């Protein structure tokens, strides 16, 4: 049923691109208030350059931020999609 479910032509070896980084911008944008606060802390737990430095507002540096840290958000979102089922 996999073929009828989707196919997802997804590249794992894509070079640092703004579209690449920005794909994750749209994921964080879809996530609710509870999630944004949580994820931002997980992502920024890696980079010191994290949002900008200021922790009051949330502005994701990902244009200038590393693709390695980019993938952290990917992991999170993939987790959020399958763990949207709360208890």
């Amino acid at each position: 049923a996999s073929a009828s479910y989707d196919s997802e032509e997804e590249e794992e070896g894509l070079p640092m691109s703004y579209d690449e980084k920005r794909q994750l911008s749209l994921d964080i944008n879809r996530l609710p208030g509870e999630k944004l606060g949580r994820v931002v802390h997980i992502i920024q737990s890696r980079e010191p350059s994290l949002r900008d430095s200021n922790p009051d507002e949330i502005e994701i540096d990902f244009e200038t931020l590393k693709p390695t840290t980019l993938r952290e958000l990917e992991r999170y979102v993939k987790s959020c999609l399958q763990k949207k089922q709360r208890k």
């Binding site: 911008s25 964080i28 944004l36 502005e59 994701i60 540096d61 990902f62």
Partner: peptide
């Protein structure tokens, strides 16, 4: 930088 991924989660 160029195309901003600087989110600013528009919750409010």
């Amino acid at each position: 930088r160029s195309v901003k991924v600087k989110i600013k989660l528009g919750r409010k």
